[PDB]
């Protein structure tokens, strides 16, 4: 009767969660004055990519940017002057993710080759060479993030994630429990826990130390494409293909707000917060990004100017700008 | 693996011609700018010529402008210096200097062995020679006619250490950071036109001349040099 | 099958985050307190004059 | 009769003016992305036809005056370039457009690899320069106030030019600016029909593509063609009356309502 | 701009020049995508097979009349494919391969073709359809051991159109079965699309070597369609 008690446990989850909540965040935040209309102006347009872009990542110094594209090149941009610090050719032109190390020393990439390539930017030779080629996944990689410049976290299309040690090159830890493809990651600000969304409308909160799924959140109805912690680390926002974002609290273990509107029908490709977490920026398939109030769930602004599908979005650490990269091979910086 | 070997020096006559060759191995020579730097036997370092990456911008010193020619050869990784109408002031040691320029580069990290050939902004060091005691902290300073701080929050000052019978290295670049391989006991500071470099605890390998360079392509002038004598 | 046993054990362990379940009102209050505590720092809400804007044209 | 000419000119203006603005609107809307060379040519056709349309009121007033020139002579010369420059250049433009279609039909891979909007802009500027020089130089080399010839005991506008000077001068530009583009248009059109005959989506779509591509030839033959035929007949047979030539002006001016909904198709 | 900034700008310009060179070189070639099922013979469509860029996905290169062709096959993925398929939305065409010899899996192939045809990302991508193992189908229909109508009842009530395409004058039942399968596939294809993308059915064997010619001709036709639609001629 293992199956029967499985749905019994899932049923009591409903009772426990209902007993946990008495009201909604809308009533609590109704007293807050609206943020108002926000108009974001484009400052720089980083051009040079000759193919559609899937991923980007800002630097810790809030100036350097890394972009990946189907052209087969990783491009490092000095966002202040729109220069090109580095152009790294790739072994495989199919890449779906990229990462910039917190120390600014290494750059990760991967895609439809089941291998995560790590490049050392700072070398005595003066060029960029493949420092490592982590292999062992049996599916396409969807995202990868540097933990502390010596270990990395990836998620693949074989419905699992992994924590690799760069020096050894082997999977130090393996995280399993997802039914469908894992498509997003988000490291906690303290780099102790991380959430990951899968193609089952399911997000999972994992502990990186013990390597086990601490919590599971549901509530969407389609594939999950993006995820991002709240700046304080006690909550996270999730984007899915059903044209809606959802805010989850780790401790409350429930829905908090649902960001959706009748006008939008297209899926969501990227989700990011602001420095203080007040603004939620989400890239859509409607060729433009939307900016919602986190505590009000209303469309506070629209970022338009892209003439193709928006595929990557990133807010800098300083919070002074947000960079968006779409399938037109153009990175636009807004502030 | 990084090696730069110079050749072509020797005895010449005034009004003659000479060719200097710089062979570089171990790194991507086609992506590094190169410099030819002169050092008189009893005076100190002096900039001569600069060739950019991809054989683009070319810069010559005022003294050797119109007489010295600098050329690059990527397929064989070689730097050529043609010299015509040599004079009595051209006798000195010539060094091949590596360089690379991007946001966070170190454009004077490597220096060649150099060869001996025999026939603006004024950058003044505070002293010329000071005695030091091993184990304690010493300080050096130098000033410039014009403030090196730029509109983009960058001050272009470089510090070089030349031990006797050894090619000078790069210690501190732009005042921003210590070059790779340099022990974290050297410290750079200052502002405007006046800058200082401090050593917390010397050793036996810190004996040598200390030069400070401002970075403007046309002048590219060095400092006088304040050698430290062990005592 | 062992998959069902593992799934049931995972659910049992997930129940035995019941203590971590705080009141939803308290969590929302903490989120608010953070938002109005750090609302001054971020430049996205309040536009910053171009004198100290690194992305000035 | 002056009444007929005035009525047809005012009708041509009243139909072309709303058509051209919608054509420009649609052309810009489609040109908001990817700057297709077809759109590059479409904007030029729209602008040239619009300049003709804004030129029609002056010629209509002139026809009402029945040969007189009520407008002050200072604006007479600028009127000519405002009415005759796009009349010939458009005839060239279609050829280039048709040429593009040929390149898109017989050499698909090469054209796709070698297509770039700046090349279309360059050839577009080249045809501007060619037509401007070839007509402006002959305006001043042969043609008192310039551009106005006055009959004896009669009111004074380019229609009182003596046949001896105006014959070869008009024929030289008529042959180069119309017959030469017409030959290219015909050759590219037959090449396009052959290429469509090689393969296509469906027979109905093959016929639709053939009809759409035929707009260039239809415009170059139906309206501008009679005007240039009158021009060359004047040079060959100077004794011919001016009624045929002037009716050629009506036939050519009908282009602004003829081509925008056929050659343009973006309206 | 100081000296170092000018040098950095020069480095960026050189990087840009290399990028444009690489981009035009890549634009010179032409790309394709291979789809199919197990034991469908999709690995022998082109008689020469290249191990270039051996990874979780197979990559092959060939050339016809001095134009290149990149063909990408996937075998390392799982059953689900709708996630990574969005990567192959700018390919010139999609080569679909169907084993027509067997009849149990024809419905599965038809469902897969329906899914690919109506995919949200492959709306404007044309499909070149290959019906592999035609000789095996001929042998199966000649033997008569496996009745065709056992799976498709509508085959019995279906008559062959008056199109005498087969020059060799093969057995009429072979032609009827081939035309029935092709009719099914083109009915699945034509039901949607409105002319944005069309299918090019073909018949191939395990011994046929004239497969590169068909792919080249279909790619030429597709590029012609793109050029014509660009000029607003469709
Ligand atoms: C060349 C020039 C000079 C010019 O000087 C302004 C006055 C300076 S001042 C007081 O010192 O004299 C002003 C203008 C407008 C022009 C000009 C510029 C461009 C085209 C054309 C006309 O071009 C045609 C118009 C019709 C015809 C032309 C040329 O030849 C044929 C015949 C009719 C036909 O087409 O059959 C004038």
Chain E residues 4-23 with a CB less than 8 Å from chain B: 4-8, 10-11, 14
Which of B70, B99, B117 is where one domain is finished?
Answer: B117
Which of B117, B135, B165 is where one domain is finished?
Answer: B117
Chain A: nearest CA to E58, how far in angstroms? 10
Closest atom of ligand 1 to D137 CA is: 1
Q: What is the dihedral of CA B104, B105, B107, B109, to 10 degrees?
A: 120
The answer to whether D232 and D166 have CB atoms below 8 angstroms apart is no
Give the 3-state secondary structure of residue E118: coil
* Correct CATH for E3-231 of 3.30.365.10, 3.40.50.300, 3.30.70.1230, 3.90.1150.10: 3.40.50.300
Task: Report d(CA D189, CA D195) in Å as an integer.
Answer: 10
Q: Pick from A126, A127, A128 the residue to mutate for testing the B interface (most B CBs within 10 Å).
A: A126
Give the 3-state secondary structure of residue B149: strand
Q: Do B and A count as touching (3 or more CB pairs closer than 8 A)?
A: yes
Ligand 1 pocket mutation pick from D59, D77, D161 by most atoms within 8 angstroms of CB: D77
In the block, which residue shows the tokens 């260039």?
A: D216
The answer to whether D205 and D87 have CB atoms below 8 angstroms apart is no
The total number of residues written for chain B in this structure: 231
Give the 3-state secondary structure of residue D190: helix
Chain A positions in Cβ-Cβ contact with residue B32 (cut-off 8 Å)? 126
With CA atoms as reference, the chain A residue closest to C7 would be: A6
Task: Report d(CA E119, CA E189) in Å as an integer.
Answer: 12
Task: Report d(CA B56, CA E12) in Å as an integer.
Answer: 13
C-beta neighbour count of E209 within 10 angstroms: 11
Task: Report d(CA A291, CA B34) in Å as an integer.
Answer: 49
**Paired sense of beta strands B227-230 and B129-132, if any:** parallel
Task: Report d(CA C24, CA A210) in Å as an integer.
Answer: 27
Q: What is the dihedral of CA A58, A60, A61, A63, to 10 degrees?
A: 0
- Contacts A–C by Cβ distance under 8 A: 142
Chain A positions in Cβ-Cβ contact with residue E15 (cut-off 8 Å)? 48, 84, 87
The answer to whether E87 and E159 have CB atoms below 8 angstroms apart is no
Q: What share of chain D is helix, strand, coil (3-state, %, to 5)?
A: 80, 0, 20
Give the 3-state secondary structure of residue B7: strand
Chain B positions in Cβ-Cβ contact with residue A125 (cut-off 8 Å)? 1-2, 26-28
Which helix H or strand E contains D227, and what residues bound it? Answer: helix D224-236
Are B113 and B146 members of one domain?
A: no
Domain ranges in chain A are 2-334
Which helix H or strand E contains B228, and what residues bound it? Answer: strand B227-230
The answer to whether A297 and A258 have CB atoms below 8 angstroms apart is yes
Buried b / exposed e along D135-168 (16+ C-beta atoms within 10 A): beeebeeebeeebeeeeeeeebbbeeeeeeebbe
Burial of E112 (C-beta count, 10 Å sphere; 0-12/13-18/19+): middle
* Neighbours, chain E (3 or more CB pairs < 8 A): A, B, D
Interface touch E19/A157, C-beta < 8 Å: no
Ligand 1 pocket mutation pick from D136, D137, D232, D249 by most atoms within 8 angstroms of CB: D136
φ/ψ (deg, to 5) at B37: -120, 130
Chain D positions in Cβ-Cβ contact with residue E194 (cut-off 8 Å)? none
Q: Which of E67, E221, E232 sits opposite D38 (nearest CB)?
A: E232
* Correct CATH for D2-264 of 1.20.1070.10, 3.40.47.10, 3.40.50.10600, 3.30.360.10: 1.20.1070.10
φ/ψ (deg, to 5) at D16: -70, -40
List the structure tokens of B13.
């006559």
Are B42 and B137 members of one domain?
A: no
The total number of residues written for chain E in this structure: 234
List the structure tokens of B137.
């902290």
Q: Which of D104, D113, D266 sits opposite E27 (nearest CB)?
A: D113
Domain A2-334 has CATH 2.130.10.10: yes
The answer to whether E36 and E42 have CB atoms below 8 angstroms apart is yes
Question: CA neighbours within 13 Å on the CB side: how many for A272?
Answer: 22
Q: What is the dihedral of CA D120, D121, D127, D131, to 10 degrees?
A: 160
Packing angle of the helix pair D37-65, D242-253 (nearest 10 deg)? 140
Task: Report d(CA B46, CA B57) in Å as an integer.
Answer: 20
Domain ranges in chain E are 3-231
What distances in angstroms separate CA E230 from CA D35, D45, E88, E200, E225, one per listed residue?
Answer: 11, 18, 21, 21, 8
The answer to whether A205 and A197 have CB atoms below 8 angstroms apart is no
φ/ψ (deg, to 5) at B185: -120, -20
Chain E positions in Cβ-Cβ contact with residue D108 (cut-off 8 Å)? 220, 223-224, 226-227
DSSP class per residue in chain C: -HHHHHHHHHHHHHH--TTT---HHHHHHHHHHHHHHHTTT-TTTS---GGG-TT--
With CA atoms as reference, the chain A residue closest to C53 would be: A320
Q: Which residues fall within 8 angstroms of residue C51, CB to CB, at 6 or more apart?
A: none
CA D168 to ligand 1 centroid distance, Å: 17
User: Which residue's CA lies nearest to atom 27 of ligand 1?
Assistant: D139
Chain A positions in Cβ-Cβ contact with residue B103 (cut-off 8 Å)? 63-64, 78, 83, 85
Are B128 and B54 members of one domain?
A: no
Q: Which residues fall within 8 angstroms of residue A6, CB to CB, at 6 or more apart?
A: C4, C7, C8, C11
Give the 3-state secondary structure of residue E195: coil
Q: Residue B97 sits in which domain range?
A: 3-117
Task: Report d(CA E162, CA A61) in Å as an integer.
Answer: 73
Q: Which residues fall within 8 angstroms of residue A266, CB to CB, at 6 or more apart?
A: A243, A284, A285, A286
Task: Report d(CA E234, CA E227) in Å as an integer.
Answer: 10
In the block, which residue shows the tokens 């393996």?
A: A174
What distances in angstroms separate CA D57 from CA A216, D62, D158, one per listed residue?
Answer: 76, 9, 17
CB-based contact, E232 to chain B, within 8 Å: no
The closest of A42, E4, A44 to B153, measured between CA atoms, is E4
List the structure tokens of B108.
């004077």
The closest of D181, D176, D36 to D98, measured between CA atoms, is D181
Question: CA neighbours within 13 Å on the CB side: how many for B42?
Answer: 1
Burial of A250 (C-beta count, 10 Å sphere; 0-12/13-18/19+): buried
Q: What is the dihedral of CA A203, A208, A212, A217, to 10 degrees?
A: -20
Task: Report d(CA A211, CA A214) in Å as an integer.
Answer: 9
φ/ψ (deg, to 5) at B106: -120, 95
The answer to whether C41 and A276 have CB atoms below 8 angstroms apart is yes
Task: Report d(CA A164, CA A88) in Å as an integer.
Answer: 23
Return the residues preceding each gap in chain C, C–N over 2.5 A, or none: 16
Task: Report d(CA D91, CA D227) in Å as an integer.
Answer: 12
CB-based contact, D109 to chain E, within 8 Å: yes
List the structure tokens of E185.
């596939």
With CA atoms as reference, the chain A residue closest to E12 would be: A84
Return the residues preceding each gap in chain D, C–N over 2.5 A, or none: 143, 156
Task: Report d(CA E156, CA E147) in Å as an integer.
Answer: 10
CB-based contact, D38 to chain E, within 8 Å: yes
Task: Report d(CA E93, CA E106) in Å as an integer.
Answer: 22
> Where do the DSSP E strands lie in B85-206?
92-99, 115-117, 123-125, 129-132, 138-144, 157-162, 169-173, 177-178, 186-191, 194-199
Q: Please give the method by which this entry was determined.
A: cryo-EM
User: Which residue's CA lies nearest to atom 32 of ligand 1?
Assistant: D139
List the structure tokens of E53.
């860029």
**A71-75 long-range contacts, Cβ below 8 Å, gap at least 24?**
A71/A329, A71/E19, A71/E22, A71/E23, A71/E26, A72/E26, A73/A49, A73/E19, A73/E22, A74/A98, A74/A107, A74/A109, A74/A119, A75/A48, A75/A49
φ/ψ (deg, to 5) at D26: -65, -40
Ligand 1 pocket mutation pick from D139, D145, D235 by most atoms within 8 angstroms of CB: D139
The answer to whether E200 and E220 have CB atoms below 8 angstroms apart is no
In the block, which residue shows the tokens 């390392």?
A: E76
Interface touch E23/A50, C-beta < 8 Å: yes
Interface touch A199/E83, C-beta < 8 Å: yes
Q: What is the dihedral of CA D194, D200, D204, D206, to 10 degrees?
A: -30
Packing angle of the helix pair D224-236, D76-106 (nearest 10 deg)? 120
Task: Report d(CA E215, CA E198) in Å as an integer.
Answer: 14
Residue B229, domain member (yes or no): no
Which of B64, B84, B117 is where one domain is finished?
Answer: B117
Task: Report d(CA D204, CA D239) in Å as an integer.
Answer: 50
Interface touch C28/A322, C-beta < 8 Å: no
Which helix H or strand E contains B69, and what residues bound it? Answer: strand B68-73
With CA atoms as reference, the chain A residue closest to C15 would be: A13
**What's this structure's resolution in Å?**
3.4
In the block, which residue shows the tokens 């003066």?
A: A126
Compute the radius of gyration of chain E from its Cα atoms.
22
Q: What is the 3-state secondary structure (H, E, C) of chain A?
A: CHHHHHHHHHHHHHHHHHHHCCCCHHHHHCCCCCCCCCCCCEEEEECCCCCCEEEEEECCCCCEEEEEECCCEEEEEECCCCCCCEEEECCCCCEEEEEECCCCCEEEEEECCCEEEEEECCCCCCCCEEEEEEECCCCCEEEEEECCCCEEEEEECCCEEEEEECCCCCEEEEEECCCCCECCCEECCCCCEEEEEECCCEEEEEECCCCEEEEEEECCCCCEEEEEECCCCCEEEEEECCCEEEEEECCCCEEEEEECCCCCCCCEEEEEECCCCCEEEEEECCCCEEEEECCCCCEEEEECCCCCCEEEEEECCCCCCEEEEECCCEEEEEC
**Paired sense of beta strands A141-146 and A171-176, if any:** unpaired
**Paired sense of beta strands A279-284 and A268-273, if any:** antiparallel
With CA atoms as reference, the chain A residue closest to B25 would be: A125
CA D140 to ligand 1 centroid distance, Å: 6
CA B182 to ligand 1 centroid distance, Å: 78
In the block, which residue shows the tokens 């290429």?
A: D195
Are B30 and B104 members of one domain?
A: yes
Chain A: nearest CA to B223, how far in angstroms? 27
CA D130 to ligand 1 centroid distance, Å: 15
Interface touch D208/E234, C-beta < 8 Å: yes
Task: Report d(CA E203, CA A152) in Å as an integer.
Answer: 49
The answer to whether D198 and D220 have CB atoms below 8 angstroms apart is no
Ligand 1 pocket mutation pick from D58, D81, D137, D149 by most atoms within 8 angstroms of CB: D81
Task: Report d(CA A131, CA A122) in Å as an integer.
Answer: 11
Task: Report d(CA E36, CA E32) in Å as an integer.
Answer: 14
Task: Report d(CA A145, CA A161) in Å as an integer.
Answer: 11
The answer to whether A222 and A265 have CB atoms below 8 angstroms apart is no
**Paired sense of beta strands E31-35 and E93-99, if any:** parallel
Task: Report d(CA A324, CA A270) in Å as an integer.
Answer: 9
φ/ψ (deg, to 5) at A244: -155, 145
The answer to whether E198 and E126 have CB atoms below 8 angstroms apart is yes
Task: Report d(CA E172, CA E175) in Å as an integer.
Answer: 5
């Amino acid at each position: 009767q293992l199956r029967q008690e499985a749905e019994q446990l899932k049923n009591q989850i409903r009772d426990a969660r209902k007993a946990c909540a008495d009201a909604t965040l809308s009533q609590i935040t109704n007293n807050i004055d609206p943020v108002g209309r926000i108009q974001m102006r484009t400052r720089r347009t980083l051009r040079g990519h000759l193919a559609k872009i899937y991923a980007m990542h800002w630097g810790t110094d809030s100036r350097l940017l890394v972009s990946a594209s189907q052209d087969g090149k990783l491009i490092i941009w000095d966002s202040y002057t729109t220069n090109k610090v580095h152009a790294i050719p790739l072994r495989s032109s199919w890449v779906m993710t990229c990462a910039y190390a917190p120390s600014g020393n290494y750059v990760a990439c991967g895609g439809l080759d089941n291998i995560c390539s790590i490049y050392n930017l700072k070398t005595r030779e003066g060029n960029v060479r493949v420092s490592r080629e982590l292999a062992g996944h049996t599916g396409y990689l969807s995202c990868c993030r540097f933990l502390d410049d010596n270990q990395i976290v990836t998620s693949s299309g074989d419905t699992t994630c992994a924590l690799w040690d760069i020096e050894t090159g082997q999977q130090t830890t393996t995280f399993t429990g997802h039914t469908g493809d894992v498509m997003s990651l988000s490291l906690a600000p303290d780099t102790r826990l991380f959430v990951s969304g899968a193609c089952d409308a399911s997000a999972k909160l994992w502990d990186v130390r013990e390597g086990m799924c601490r919590q599971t959140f549901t509530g969407h109805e389609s594939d999950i494409n993006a995820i991002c912690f709240f700046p304080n680390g006690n909550a996270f926002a999730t984007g899915s293909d059903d044209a809606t974002c959802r805010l989850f609290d780790l401790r409350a273990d429930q829905e908090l707000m649902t960001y959706s509107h009748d006008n939008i029908i297209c899926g969501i490709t990227s989700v990011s917060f602001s420095k203080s977490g007040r603004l939620l920026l989400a890239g859509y398939d409607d060729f433009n990004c939307n900016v919602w109030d986190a505590l009000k769930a209303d469309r506070a602004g629209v970022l338009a100017g892209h003439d193709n599908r928006v595929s990557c979005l990133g807010v800098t650490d300083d919070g002074m700008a947000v960079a968006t990269g779409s399938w037109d091979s153009f990175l636009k910086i807004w502030n | 693996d990084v090696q730069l070997v110079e050749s072509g020096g020797g005895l010449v006559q005034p009004g003659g011609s000479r060719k200097l060759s710089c062979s570089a191995s171990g790194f991507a020579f086609s992506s590094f700018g190169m410099h030819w730097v002169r050092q008189a036997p009893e005076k100190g370092l002096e900039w001569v010529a600069y060739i950019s990456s991809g054989s683009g911008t070319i810069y010559y010193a005022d003294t050797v402008k119109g007489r010295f020619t600098i050329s690059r050869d990527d397929p064989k990784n070689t730097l050529f210096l043609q010299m015509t109408s040599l004079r009595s002031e051209d006798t000195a040691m010539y060094y091949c200097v590596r360089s690379i320029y991007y946001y966070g580069s170190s454009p004077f990290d490597f220096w060649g062995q150099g060869t001996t050939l025999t026939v603006d902004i004024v950058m003044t060091q505070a002293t010329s020679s000071v005695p030091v005691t091993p184990g304690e902290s010493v300080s050096i300073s130098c000033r410039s006619s014009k403030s090196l701080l730029h509109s983009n929050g960058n001050t272009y000052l470089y510090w070089f250490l030349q031990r006797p019978g050894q090619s000078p290295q790069l210690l501190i670049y732009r005042m921003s950071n210590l070059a790779s391989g340099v022990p974290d006991r050297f410290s750079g500071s200052g502002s405007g036109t006046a800058f200082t470099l401090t050593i917390s605890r010397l050793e036996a390998e810190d004996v040598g001349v200390y030069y400070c360079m401002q970075h403007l392509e046309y002048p590219l002038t060095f400092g006088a040099g304040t050698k430290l004598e062990l005592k | 099958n062992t998959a069902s046993i593992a799934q049931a054990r995972k659910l049992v362990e997930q129940l035995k985050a019941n203590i971590d379940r705080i009141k939803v009102s308290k969590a929302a209050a903490d989120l608010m307190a953070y938002c109005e505590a750090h609302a001054k720092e971020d430049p996205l809400l309040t536009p910053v004059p171009a004198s100290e804007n690194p992305f000035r044209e | 009769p002056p009444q007929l000419s005035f009525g047809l000119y005012v009708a041509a203006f009243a139909l072309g003016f709303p058509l051209n603005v919608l054509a420009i609107r649609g052309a810009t809307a489609h040109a908001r992305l990817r700057l297709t060379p077809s759109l590059v040519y479409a904007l030029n056709l729209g602008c040239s036809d619009l300049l003709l349309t804004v030129s029609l009121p002056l010629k209509a007033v002139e026809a009402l005056a029945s040969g007189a020139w009520p407008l002050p002579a200072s604006l007479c010369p600028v009127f000519a370039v405002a009415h005759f420059f796009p009349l010939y250049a458009g005839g060239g433009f279609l050829a280039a457009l048709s040429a593009g279609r040929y390149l898109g039909a017989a050499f698909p891979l090469g054209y796709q690899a070698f297509r770039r909007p700046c090349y279309s802009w360059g050839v577009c500027a080249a045809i501007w320069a060619l037509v401007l020089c070839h007509l402006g130089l002959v305006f001043g080399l042969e043609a008192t106030s310039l551009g106005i010839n006055t009959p004896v005991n009669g009111s004074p506008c380019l229609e009182a030019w003596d046949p001896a000077s105006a014959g070869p001068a008009r024929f030289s530009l008529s042959l180069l600016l119309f017959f030469l583009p017409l030959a290219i248009t015909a050759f590219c059109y037959v090449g396009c029909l052959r290429a469509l005959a090689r393969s296509g989506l469906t027979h109905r779509r093959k016929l639709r593509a053939a009809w759409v591509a035929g707009g260039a030839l239809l415009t170059l033959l139906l309206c501008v063609g009679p005007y240039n035929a009158s021009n060359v007949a004047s040079f060959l047979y100077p004794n011919l009356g001016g009624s045929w030539r002037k009716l050629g002006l009506i036939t050519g001016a009908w282009s602004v309502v003829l081509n925008p909904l056929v050659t343009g198709y973006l309206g | 701009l100081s000296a170092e900034d000018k040098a950095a700008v020069e480095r960026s310009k050189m990087i840009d020049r290399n990028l444009r060179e690489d981009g035009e070189k890549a634009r010179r070639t032409l790309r394709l995508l291979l789809l199919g099922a197990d034991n469908s013979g999709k690995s022998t469509i082109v008689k020469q097979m290249r191990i270039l860029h051996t990874s979780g996905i197979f990559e092959t290169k060939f050339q016809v009349d001095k134009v290149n062709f990149h063909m990408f096959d996937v075998g390392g993925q799982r059953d689900e494919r709708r996630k990574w398929i969005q990567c192959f939305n700018d390919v010139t065409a999609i080569i679909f391969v169907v084993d027509s010899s067997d009849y149990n899996r024809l419905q599965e192939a038809l469902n897969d073709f329906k899914s690919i045809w109506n995919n949200r990302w492959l709306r404007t991508i044309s499909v070149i359809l290959f019906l592999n193992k035609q000789d095996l189908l001929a042998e199966k229909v000649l033997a008569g051991k496996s009745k065709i109508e056992d799976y498709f009842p509508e085959f019995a009530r279906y008559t062959t159109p008056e199109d005498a395409t087969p020059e060799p004058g093969e057995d009429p039942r072979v032609t009827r079965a081939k035309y029935f399968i092709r009719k099914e596939f083109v009915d699945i294809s034509t039901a949607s699309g409105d002319g944005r993308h069309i299918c090019y059915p073909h018949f191939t064997c395990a011994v046929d070597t004239e497969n590169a010619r068909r792919i080249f001709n279909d790619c030429k036709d597709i590029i012609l369609q793109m050029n014509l639609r660009e000029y607003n001629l469709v």
